[PDB]
Amino acid sequence: TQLQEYVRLLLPWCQVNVGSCHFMLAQCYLVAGEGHKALDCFSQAASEVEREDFLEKLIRVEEGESVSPRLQYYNRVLRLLEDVGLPELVIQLATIAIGEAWRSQAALRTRIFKHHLDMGHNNQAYDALTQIPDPSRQLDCLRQLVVVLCERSQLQDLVEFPYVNLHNEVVGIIESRARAVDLMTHNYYELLYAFHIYRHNYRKAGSVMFEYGMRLG
Amino acid sequence: ATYTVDCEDYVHVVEFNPFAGSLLAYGGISYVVIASCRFQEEDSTVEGIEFKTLKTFHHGERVVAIAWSPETRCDALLPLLRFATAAGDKKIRIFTFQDKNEYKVIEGHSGYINDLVFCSPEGTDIASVGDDHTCRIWDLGKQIAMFILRSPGMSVAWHPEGAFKLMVAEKTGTIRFYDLTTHQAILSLEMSADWCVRNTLRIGAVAGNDWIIWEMQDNKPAHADRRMFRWSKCNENVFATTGYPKSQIAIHHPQPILIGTPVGSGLSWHRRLPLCVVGGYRKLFFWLTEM
Amino acid sequence: LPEDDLAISDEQEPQEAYLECLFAPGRFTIAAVQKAIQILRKGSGRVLDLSWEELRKDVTLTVENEIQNQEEFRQINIENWCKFYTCCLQYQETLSRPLALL
């Protein structure tokens, strides 16, 4: 409240106005629930002050600056907005952090999985989902993330995007999903939507999945 | 009860009042999605209202704030729509996807643009306020005005039924009454400020949640109570507030908390008052309120 | 030396400038300002339970409420603030009496 009262004074004469002050305006606005104004301050000001011992506030930036270089500013703000639960703004900064960009990539990418999973909303990024199995065997990232997108549960739209996704990946992801469909849930529809993916392919497994569902019933 | 739709991208929400009149605009990262309010329900229970996502307009830049122009029309299927918009790069634009007016450069704002409004004279006026400490008028031959504010302009709105006067809310808390036509600073008072009724009332809302009511005796506020104020369009006395960071939505005129959803991005009232449109992170929502 | 004038607009309008020049002089106490507020009103101890900013607002609002309506309004508003400043200082100079040195 006291920080919020004095916020106007953190912007004064131009010679006395620094990126560290603006980064403080942004945090004050996060604490006081002014998440829009916090973003405006984070976007305009950059913290590229990796070695400033004086401010305890910079430690969270600096902990990643000791690991990594300047894309770390967006990676930090990404995490800060995760910590306060603002999940549209988090995602944009994760995308900014990749676009501003070996060990660093792997750590940031494992964060991207954790952070994208928790929000669920940014996890509609299908071409990004497809761009993960083609480089390497991180199929399990797609498997858990597409399940959270199935939890969002817009199956017409949801099944149309695996038309874009490569059929080799779609067969492994949809078969892995179909084994998860054997959940014994009251969601009868999951078998029918599996039958539609089987319809696209050789169709053979849709008949077998029906006898399996008959047996349980 | 309520009607709910998932949304891919979300920012600010405005409802269409200046003229197509049952349609809704969602500010987004790419640009704006236009939805239609449809009265129909197939069950034959009425006063159940759905959103149809008609189309996504693309700009390639984030829309922070949007207002509709009365110049919008609907023909035989094709919607002719005009928007006054705020973009991430501190631009105020007028969209027709035939053309886009740009206001930027030296003449434009060099700070974040908090708010924008549109009004209709014998021509059309766009007013906008920024963190640059300016209020700008755009007249639609292109004429511009640049006025200094004492502190960053958080909100701006024109006098309803009286296009010449406007309100500015400065972040410092000064509320100013501006007449572009006459002497610029007509009056002053000490999150947003806005008008109510046929401008018969003036509101002033702080982020600490104190709120002032003026029936524009001395200039002292007539009454005051306790977020950012969102005005009920038809009823002067019905007043809406929200908890952005949860989802507590309060309707004030005692203290009712009518709605509790997740985070709330932005919300607005339906063109005739029956619904409130709410944008959350993943979803857009129609809530019916009665009384 | 203290000097005072009208304002074109750089250091705001006279009301703001007189409010700062009344709160800031080193010959000022709260009780003398509160006693001066009583002269342009009524009241007594109830001004003690006000915040420092609320006290600034009551002084400023009291001066504005008296003045009625551009040039005469500015002149009359300056004079009321000058009278108030003088009255506050006069009650205060009773305090400037020294009592002891330790």
Automatic annotation (TrEMBL), chain B:
Q: Which residues form a coiled coil?
A: none
In this record, what's one Pfam family? WD40
SUPFAM superfamilies per the UniProt record, alphabetical: WD40 repeat-like
GO biological process terms on file: cell division; chromosome segregation; mRNA transport; protein transport
Per the record, GO CC terms?
cytosol; kinetochore; nuclear pore outer ring
What stretches of residues are WD repeats? 106-147
The reply to whether Translocase figures as a keyword in the UniProt entry is no
- What InterPro entries does the annotation carry? NUP37, WD40/YVTN_repeat-like_dom_sf, WD40_repeat_CS, WD40_repeat_dom_sf, WD40_rpt
List localization entries: Chromosome, Centromere, Kinetochore; Nucleus, Nuclear pore complex
Keyword RNA-binding on this protein?
no
Arranged from A to Z, the UniProt key words for this protein are: Cell cycle, Cell division, Centromere, Chromosome, Chromosome partition, Kinetochore, Mitosis, mRNA transport, Nuclear pore complex, Nucleus, Protein transport, Repeat, Translocation, Transport, WD repeat
Physiological role: Component of the Nup107-160 subcomplex of the nuclear pore complex (NPC). The Nup107-160 subcomplex is required for the assembly of a functional NPC. The Nup107-160 subcomplex is also required for normal kinetochore microtubule attachment, mitotic progression and chromosome segregation.
How does this protein assemble? Component of the Nup107-160 subcomplex of the nuclear pore complex (NPC). The Nup107-160 subcomplex includes NUP160, NUP133, NUP107, NUP98, NUP85, NUP43, NUP37, SEH1 and SEC13.
Q: What is this protein called?
A: Nucleoporin Nup37
List the gene name. nup37.L
